[PDB]
Design a protein. Structure first.
Length: 52
């Protein structure tokens, strides 16, 4: 289960934590984020993330 990192700002999307503020429950894999999901810290698109 992969952590993904925002190439713009360095925020880490952690699947074990999800992103409740965006309606993403804990345990949601990166692949299951919608394409309109954005980095909570900098606003960059999901497609700006890379696998850590
Ligand atoms: Fe970011």
């Amino acid at each position: 289960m992969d952590i993904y990192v925002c190439t713009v700002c360095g925020y880490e999307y952690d699947p074990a934590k999800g992103d409740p503020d965006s309606g993403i429950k804990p345990g949601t894999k990166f692949e299951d984020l919608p394409d309109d999901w954005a980095c909570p810290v900098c606003g960059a698109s999901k497609d700006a993330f890379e696998k850590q």
